[PDB]
Design a protein around this ligand. Structure first.
Ligand SMILES: COc1ccc2[nH]c(-c3ccccc3)c(CCNC(C)=O)c2c1
Length: 483
């Protein structure tokens, strides 16, 4: 239809104008604003340079080609314009990966140190990204996989020339970065929820009265057992979640060992009546095993964390693991499954890590925990506290920039997911699938991808307070005369 042709031209005109003005504002703002002048934003400047390239030479030729309803320029213009569109779109996905790693390394640095993370080698990594993308786009000139597509009025990467090239492009320059970025932002989100989650004004040693040795002697006395190395579990009783069954099997393995006499176990929780029986059975057979099926208050749990020597976390699946942080507040050394969430909290100096679902490896860990002398235990406890303390320090920070960068990525993925999905579909049978795929779907997936080249300036102005203020600062400074 006549309107379908002129509609596409509007989209490109809009994309071009917004891209040039908007990305000039992004590059200006970063070098103008002191807060935006960080080296971690070098990745944002190269991304704006990548976005700008397509609007000066390739996109205006595509716009002219709509009106000509054909390629009226040379084969060389068809090759160079197709090439620079490659450099831009491949450069931008890798630059987005660069930001995703930079930000994940920034949160980790602020957790371990009081000094601000300085992305010192950031400019050196941007030079590797453009060497990586130039290495990926350049083989296409000799392969002859760049040609004109009448359906979208442009010269681009033809997905039907050779399926091997298109499969590799979809795998290495879309799926691989996707997995890396999804991993970076997932690990960031969990660490923010842990920062949010902890309460240092509740889980605080100040509320505990005497000495640790005293508190423990008193706790054990109430339970009717002598002084020993005491271990505690606090969780639901279930087959494949919190792993009280791995702990129960471990207590059985240790009951034949001489070293068991020196051990004390406080198992707290409820759930499977079978796992309740097994636990009550070990309680009757051994006077160093105590089970608490009742529900205890935060206050009493806080006293237990400040008395017991170790907290066992034998979980199969533990997304956040606030329990470990809560225990570390009151100097309880955790022995926990090296699963997600707990591996982020427990460092090698602040606890013992074990492979989930192995009663043998847990039994040996408990034996290793027993062999630790008072002196080693004091440093371990001190470390545990310095680790909990580093989580709560990040509480007043502004986590808005993480959201803006995440939105910049999410929108990139939406714009390019159809193109890459079609890419795969065409790769399966280029001869058969070129007609079998709808024309509206094809034209939409290409112009959606083109539209992405103007989105980042709009996002920065809508979610980042600094970019919003600076955009206005520049606009006025150029349009308000001096007299
Ligand atoms: C591999 O070398 C090149 C070379 C030139 C290229 N130009 C484009 C492209 C630019 C803007 C919008 C859509 C596609 C790609 C991306 C091509 N991806 C797919 C799935 O066909 C490209 C790749």
């Amino acid at each position: 239809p006549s309107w379908l042709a002129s509609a596409l031209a509007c989209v490109l005109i809009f994309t071009i104008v917004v891209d040039i003005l908007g990305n000039l504002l992004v590059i200006l703002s970063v070098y103008r604003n002191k807060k935006l002048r960080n080296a971690g934003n070098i990745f944002v400047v190269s991304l704006a340079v990548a976005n700008l390239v397509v609007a000066i030479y390739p996109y205006p030729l595509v716009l002219m080609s709509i009106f000509n309803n054909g390629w009226n320029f040379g084969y060389l213009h068809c090759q160079v314009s197709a090439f620079l569109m490659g450099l831009s779109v491949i450069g931008s996905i890798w630059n987005i990966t660069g930001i995703a790693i930079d930000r994940y390394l920034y949160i980790c640095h602020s957790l371990k140190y009081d000094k601000l993370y300085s992305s010192k080698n950031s400019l050196c990594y941007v030079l590797l990204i453009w060497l990586l993308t130039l290495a990926a786009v350049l083989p296409n000139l000799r392969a002859g996989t760049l040609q004109y597509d009448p359906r979208i009025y442009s010269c681009t990467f033809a997905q039907s020339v050779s399926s091997a090239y298109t499969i590799a492009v979809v795998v290495f320059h879309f799926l691989v970065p996707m997995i890396i970025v999804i991993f970076c932002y997932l690990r960031i989100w969990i660490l923010v929820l842990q920062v949010r989650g902890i309460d240092c004004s509740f889980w605080n040693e100040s509320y505990l009265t005497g000495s640790r040795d005293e508190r423990k002697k008193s706790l054990l006395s109430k339970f009717g057992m002598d002084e020993g190395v005491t271990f505690m579990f606090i969780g639901r009783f279930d087959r494949g979640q919190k792993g009280v069954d791995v702990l129960l099997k471990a207590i059985e393995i240790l009951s034949s060992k001489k070293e068991f006499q020196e051990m004390r176990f406080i198992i707290i929780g409820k759930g499977d009546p079978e796992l309740e029986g097994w636990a009550r059975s070990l309680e009757e057979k051994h006077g160093n095993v105590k089970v608490i099926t009742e529900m205890l208050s935060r206050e009493f749990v806080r006293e237990l964390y400040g008395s017991v020597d170790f907290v066992i976390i034998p979980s199969y699946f533990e997304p956040f693991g606030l329990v470990a942080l809560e225990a570390m507040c009151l100097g309880a050394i955790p022995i926990a499954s090296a699963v997600g969430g707990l591996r982020d909290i427990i460092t090698n100096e602040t606890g013992i890590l074990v492979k989930a679902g192995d009663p043998g490896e847990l039994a040996n860990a408990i034996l290793k925990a027993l062999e630790l002398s008072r002196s080693d235990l004091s440093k371990f406890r001190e470390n545990c506290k310095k680790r909990a303390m580093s989580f709560s320090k990040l509480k007043p920070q502004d986590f808005r920039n993480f959201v803006t960068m995440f939105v910049v990525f999410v929108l990139f993925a939406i714009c390019f997911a159809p193109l890459n999905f079609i890419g795969l579909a065409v790769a399966s049978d280029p001869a058969s699938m070129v007609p079998r795929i709808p024309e509206w779907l094809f034209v939409a997936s290409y112009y959606m991808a083109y539209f992405n080249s103007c989105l980042n300036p709009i996002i920065y102005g809508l979610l980042d307070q600094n970019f919003r203020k600076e955009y206005r600062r520049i606009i006025v400074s150029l349009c308000t005369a001096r007299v």
